[PDB]
Write a protein that binds this ligand. Structure first.
Ligand SMILES: CCOC(=O)C1CCN(c2cnccn2)CC1
Length: 284
């Protein structure tokens, strides 16, 4: 039985290596990674890989790994796929922990924009969780943390992390992680997956996919929102992505909103993530 070596980048930045039979389905590898991570609430997570166009793709757990990575390396990342709107409802602290690690990368990467004060508050909770109580012996007036907190670090932000860390004395890691999540879950881009697109007049927009529905960003002014219940059918064809939008009470007919994606694979990827979000958040 021939086995392929898999390398998975974990949310702490470490590399997990394992082997699976070369005709394995994605679920096989994902089960090995989740066991390694002692993760039981696996439904919120998945593995990503980079396709021949260098686009992030979700590894479909029901399909052969080889028919997805195709010509590429068996290299993956472990990631949050479905961001829970209320992380307090998760059953296990360790689940909340992995969600914190993902969110920390969302913030540092700039995928999750955040005010100065919220960057410092989230950072202060991370430090409390990881180092415990504020120790002056560690930090002087020139302190810079090893922790990456933000897309652009400033001395002012380091100072504010320390000021807020001082306020958290006696806070346990689970408690600090829950506070982290209570703040992060409120940010306008929390759990929003952004896709570049053009509207039916060729005007560049972003489509965001999240728990509450599909968001259309025309810019920072005029954001259209389609709650999952107002969406009846999602489809792609060639480079085009279509959603059916319900008739408003006493309306005879659904409306169609069409988008142009960069290429056919980008349209299909957007369709699959929308269908998965629609299903997941219909049941939550
Ligand atoms: C370096 C990665 O940066 C991002 O993902 C940001 C995310 C936020 N943002 C938005 C927000 N709404 C509509 C359109 N774009 C700019 C791109």
């Amino acid at each position: 039985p021939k086995s392929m070596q898999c390398k998975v980048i974990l949310l702490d930045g470490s590399e997990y290596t394992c082997d699976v039979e070369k005709r394995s389905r994605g679920q096989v590898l994902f089960d090995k990674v989740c066991e390694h991570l002692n993760l039981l609430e696996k439904d919120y997570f998945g593995l990503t890989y980079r396709d021949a166009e260098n686009q992030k793709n979700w590894l479909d757990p029901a399909k052969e790994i080889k028919k997805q990575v195709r010509s590429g390396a068996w290299h993956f990342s472990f990631n949050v796929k479905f961001y829970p709107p209320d992380p307090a409802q998760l059953s296990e602290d360790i689940t909340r922990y992995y969600l914190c690690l993902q969110l920390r990368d969302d913030i540092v990467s700039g995928r999750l924009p955040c005010s100065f004060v919220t960057l410092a508050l989230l950072g202060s909770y991370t430090v409390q969780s990881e180092l415990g109580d504020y120790d002056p012996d560690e930090c002087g007036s020139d302190y810079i943390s090893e922790f990456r907190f933000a897309p652009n670090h400033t001395k002012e932000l380091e100072d504010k992390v320390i000021e807020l860390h001082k306020s958290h004395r006696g806070m346990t890691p689970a408690e600090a992680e829950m506070h982290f999540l209570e703040n992060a879950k409120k940010l306008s881009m929390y759990g929003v997956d952004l896709h570049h697109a053009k509207d039916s007049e060729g005007v560049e927009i972003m489509l965001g996919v999240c728990a509450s529905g599909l968001l259309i960003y025309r810019d920072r002014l005029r954001i259209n929102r389609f709650a999952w219940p107002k969406v009846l059918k999602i489809s792609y064809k060639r480079n085009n992505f279509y959603i059916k939008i319900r008739p408003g009470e006493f309306e005879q007919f659904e409306s169609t909103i069409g988008f142009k994606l960069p290429n056919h694979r980008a349209a299909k990827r957007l369709w699959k993530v929308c269908v998965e979000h629609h299903t997941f958040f219909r049941l939550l």
